[PDB]
Design a protein around this nucleic acid. Structure first.
Length: 328
RNA sequence: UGUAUAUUA
């Protein structure tokens, strides 16, 4: 019950060493010490949230505070979620707030506030992590808003440096109904997403998560749409990563290697040998077929061996493919 | 030989 600093808690926030202190205070006190710090600081929560040290207090304050006090802090901050979210410190406090909310009124207020700005926050360096925490902590019933918003600006988000990370959370935490809708849209531009600096990552993730669950739906729909362009995509900087992902995925592996032999032929396999990215594909196709199926490995092997003549033998990738020809 | 992802003191 020993407070010498009471009455002037707010001034202790000006310095890093002042905020660190208030937190040790909350750490050891910590109930009565919350009614205290709460009542003195509430009026500056959106200011403290976006501050270098305050925000840490706010984060301790949220763990320690009661429900009613959180609902007040939440009500006080909601008009300021956008500016809070685009902030490096603010994003941290707001994320914490979301981690701490227990009631539906709280989740209601938060989604209500964030709704109109989902796509915007989802393209933001600091903001996108607020959107991700909604996906990670809230009931699907609640974050339905995010899925709606993101499903509509689907390609915009999937092809964005940060947007693409939010899609990955959507796939992590959403309902089957929600993901299937998201994916149905994603699939409508699997071609363009595949060739994209960021979209290719989303394509790979759909495959990753199905392989995770051992239940395959869009993995097949992707492979169906893409496979006919196996070679063309194998020699693309980004698309080649998708092709390599398909190859490393056992339920679709053989068909795709078979696509290389079938419609690539000796020609397309030459292209792969000499290409900046294509050769990594060839290496993987060889590595995999080796492990998975000898007929395929042999058919591969006997086309490569004749083509591994000349200056190619001395190249970095040449040596690396040469070393993949007698593994049995 | 080839891609992203603030880990605020």
């Amino acid at each position: 019950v020993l407070d010498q600093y009471i009455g002037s808690i707010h001034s202790l926030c000006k310095d890093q060493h002042g905020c660190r202190f208030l937190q040790k205070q909350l750490d050891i006190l910590g109930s009565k010490a919350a009614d205290a710090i709460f009542e003195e600081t509430k009026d500056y929560t959106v200011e403290l949230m976006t501050d270098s040290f305050g925000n840490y207090l706010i984060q301790k304050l949220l763990e320690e505070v009661t429900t009613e006090q959180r609902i007040v802090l939440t009500k006080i901050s909601s008009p300021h979620f956008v500016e809070i979210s685009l902030n490096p410190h603010g994003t941290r406090a707001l994320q914490k707030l979301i981690e701490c909310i227990k009631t539906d009124e709280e989740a209601q207020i938060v989604v209500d506030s964030l709704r109109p700005y989902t796509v915007q926050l989802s393209k933001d360096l600091n903001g996108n992590h607020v959107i991700q925490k909604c996906l990670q902590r809230l009931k699907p019933e609640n974050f339905q808003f995010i899925f709606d918003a993101i499903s509509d600006s689907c390609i915009d988000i999937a092809t964005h440096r940060h947007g693409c990370c939010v899609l990955q959370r959507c796939l992590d935490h959403g309902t089957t109904e929600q993901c299937d809708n998201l994916c149905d849209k994603l699939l409508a531009l699997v071609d363009k997403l595949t060739l994209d600096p960021f979209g290719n990552y989303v394509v790979q993730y759909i495959i990753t998560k199905e392989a995770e669950k051992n239940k395959y739906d869009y993995t097949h729909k992707i492979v169906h749409l893409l496979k006919p362009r196996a070679i063309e995509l194998s020699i693309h900087k980004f698309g080649s990563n998708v092709i390599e992902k398909i190859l490393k995925t056992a339920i679709v592996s053989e068909p795709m290697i078979l696509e290389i032999l079938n419609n690539g032929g000796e020609t397309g396999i030459q292209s792969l040998l000499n290409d900046s990215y294509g050769n990594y594909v060839l290496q993987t196709a060889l590595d995999i077929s080796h492990k998975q199926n000898d007929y395929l490995y042999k058919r591969l092997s006997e086309i490569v061996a004749p083509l591994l003549v000349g200056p190619i033998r001395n190249t970095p990738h040449g040596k690396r493919i040469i070393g993949m020809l007698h593994l049995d």
